[PDB]
Design brief:
The chain is mostly beta strands. 11% of the residues lie in helices and 32% in strands. The protein has one domain.
Length: 97
């Protein structure tokens, strides 16, 4: 199975896919503070509405507390990236299989 490598920790692909659909399920900042929204006129304007929603490295979906990893996505995931809440090395790498 594919996965994302976040600074030496595997984020399961199914968790990222779950975060895409959860991100667009909730009103802005209403599910334990998330999702963040980036609407028309924002730095994401050209890709359509983008949302930020946290993701776990474990067999669970996020629902409160510290945010260590997160996704950015548009509704269809035609834009989809995964990040860790660190500095320089924040972007996670997609690994096929």
């Amino acid at each position: 199975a594919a996965y994302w490598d976040c600074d030496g920790t595997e984020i399961p692909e199914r968790n990222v896919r779950a975060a895409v659909v959860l991100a667009f399920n909730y009103r802005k900042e209403s599910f334990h503070g998330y999702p963040a929204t980036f609407i028309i006129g924002s730095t994401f304007s050209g890709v359509g509405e983008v949302r930020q929603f946290p993701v776990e490295d474990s067999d669970a979906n996020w629902q409160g507390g510290a945010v260590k990893y997160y996704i950015l996505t548009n509704k269809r995931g035609s834009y989809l990236e995964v990040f860790s809440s660190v500095g320089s090395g924040n972007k996670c790498t997609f690994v096929e299989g």
